[PDB]
Amino acid sequence: LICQSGDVLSARYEIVDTLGEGAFGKVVECIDHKAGGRHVAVKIVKNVDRYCEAARSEIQVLEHLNTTDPNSTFRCVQMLEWFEHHGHICIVFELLGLSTYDFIKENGFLPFRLDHIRKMAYQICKSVNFLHSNKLTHTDLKPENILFVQSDYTEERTLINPDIKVVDFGSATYDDEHHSTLVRHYRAPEVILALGWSQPCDVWSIGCILIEYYLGFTVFPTHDSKEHLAMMERILGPLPKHMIQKTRKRKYFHHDRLDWDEHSSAGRYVSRACKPLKEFMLSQDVEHERLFDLIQKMLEYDPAKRITLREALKHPFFDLLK
Ligand SMILES: O=C(O)c1ccc2c(c1)nc(Nc1cccc(Cl)c1)c1ccncc12
């Protein structure tokens, strides 16, 4: 909320540029003048209470992981400190590279080479499973929350070092806590249908993330609940009967079916740009297919019967990493 370059925060950090913006506010690269000049990333949070207590939660999550895993072994972003600055909350992070979304974005939305996807997939899975081990759900996993450590590339840009870290913990919730409904192009189905969530909804996102690394685009491109539900079914097949029945938000559930118009102009938009999952493959080579096996397991409709990351890390697709 209106900052600028060359500025100084809390008499220590000097803004050099802006790494990105969001509804919460922004992230800037600074020079830390009281730590020898190290570049760091600083998250300045708009002074709206909604974002202010998200930030406060985030700080306690970040402090938990940071003490439990001070080595960043499990690759969750490291918080260096926080402060207040004219009513704005500021969180200081280790400085990292581009988002995976941003990197793809500036590469013509070319996808990642499968061997890079594998190492990325492994680290995300391993990192979030850590959160999962500690009674935490991220709820907000997306390609934009996964950043390369160094995002240098050769060039059709080829990424040098696919090492990543997992970042935004504003939304992360403990099991010991009340389970929200916030708002998003990667929400699990047990989330849209207001049926309760927990660790298995992180796994859903990871599936969606891995389709995107593979194709270079998303396959659930709509911030509309109905459109999404229909996309889900064209790609993954029929929604389980029981979930449709035991849903509080039983608005678009007519005669126990999805009350969507396959016949409407908007319907054709859903059909014209979505096919069954396995039709998205671009090779039928063995390792392409191990991957889609994993993705299909991750995209199981029933969170109760959905693969866990503890399992996912043992899947065939990762064998070459061993
Ligand atoms: O939320 C965090 O924990 C969080 C923590 C660290 C970074 C971050 C978000 N976002 C960066 N980039 C970014 C890119 C686009 C939009 C926005 Cl808002 C931010 C970034 C860059 C370099 N080093 C650390 C970070």
Side-chain angles (χ1 to χ4, degrees), residues 1-33 35-49 51-125 127-134 136-149 151-155 157-177 179-182 186-222 224-225 227-240 242-245 247 258-261 264-267 270-271 273-277 279-295 297-304 306-313 315-321:
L1 185 56
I2 310 333
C3 156
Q4 188 60 56
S5 327
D7 284 333
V8 179
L9 279 38
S10 187
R12 185 178 167 172
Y13 311 93
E14 171 198 351
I15 317 178
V16 313
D17 185 61
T18 289
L19 300 168
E21 331 201 344
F24 74 96
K26 29 195 296 197
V27 172
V28 294
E29 178 173 42
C30 303
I31 295 177
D32 190 337
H33 284 278
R38 300 148 190 260
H39 291 240
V40 294
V42 185
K43 180 157 158 177
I44 303 129
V45 178
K46 283 174 170 129
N47 205 12
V48 182
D49 183 65
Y51 294 120
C52 267
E53 272 230 50
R56 249 160 197 130
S57 166
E58 183 180 22
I59 289 193
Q60 272 127 25
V61 169
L62 282 171
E63 190 96 31
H64 176 209
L65 315 180
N66 263 253
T67 50
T68 296
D69 180 27
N71 288 331
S72 205
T73 298
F74 295 98
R75 293 190 165 282
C76 306
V77 62
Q78 195 155 310
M79 155 172 85
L80 312 171
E81 247 300 272
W82 69 275
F83 56 87
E84 295 172 10
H85 190 88
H86 299 305
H88 287 147
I89 290 184
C90 293
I91 305 168
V92 189
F93 295 92
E94 41 163 354
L95 185 79
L96 316 160
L98 307 176
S99 99
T100 65
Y101 181 81
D102 285 321
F103 187 100
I104 291 185
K105 168 178 97 174
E106 291 169 22
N107 201 12
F109 288 87
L110 297 182
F112 287 115
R113 237 189 42 214
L114 187 111
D115 325 278
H116 281 340
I117 298 200
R118 192 183 279 103
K119 298 166 227 184
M120 285 146 65
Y122 191 88
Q123 306 190 323
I124 299 174
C125 272
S127 167
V128 189
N129 172 74
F130 174 48
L131 300 181
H132 284 185
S133 313
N134 297 254
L136 274 174
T137 304
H138 190 284
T139 82
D140 198 339
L141 288 163
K142 46 174 193 206
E144 310 72 43
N145 278 339
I146 313 284
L147 278 55
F148 296 106
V149 160
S151 48
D152 209 349
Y153 53 88
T154 39
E155 64 185 346
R157 304 171 178 177
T158 296
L159 197 146
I160 309 314
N161 168 43
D163 279 24
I164 65 93
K165 289 223 184 176
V166 175
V167 292
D168 187 351
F169 293 104
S171 306
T173 318
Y174 291 95
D175 306 337
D176 332 324
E177 292 178 349
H179 275 43
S180 325
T181 323
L182 206 182
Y186 307 84
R187 28 193 66 202
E190 86 254 31
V191 146
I192 320 175
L193 309 192
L195 297 173
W197 44 270
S198 37
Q199 292 50 28
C201 74
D202 275 336
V203 183
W204 179 267
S205 301
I206 297 189
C208 303
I209 284 157
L210 294 205
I211 291 168
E212 295 199 16
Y213 294 156
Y214 186 87
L215 300 176
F217 54 86
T218 180
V219 294
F220 301 150
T222 180
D224 183 316
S225 298
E227 289 194 71
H228 197 203
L229 273 203
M231 281 170 193
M232 273 200 196
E233 235 159 13
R234 200 167 204 296
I235 296 192
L236 292 193
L239 301 188
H242 74 300
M243 282 172 78
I244 301 191
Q245 163 278 346
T247 276
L258 183 52
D259 191 26
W260 163 265
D261 203 353
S264 83
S265 190
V270 172
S271 293
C274 290
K275 21 174 171 176
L277 184 67
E279 270 167 74
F280 276 118
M281 297 187 62
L282 305 174
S283 167
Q284 238 152 18
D285 187 288
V286 51
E287 269 295 335
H288 275 248
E289 233 152 51
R290 316 219 188 168
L291 173 70
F292 264 81
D293 180 44
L294 188 51
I295 282 168
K297 293 181 165 32
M298 275 161 163
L299 288 202
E300 164 66 27
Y301 272 132
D302 197 348
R306 188 178 266 148
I307 182 181
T308 79
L309 303 182
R310 212 164 12 224
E311 274 119 51
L313 278 176
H315 192 280
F317 178 70
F318 303 115
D319 292 313
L320 305 86
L321 283 151

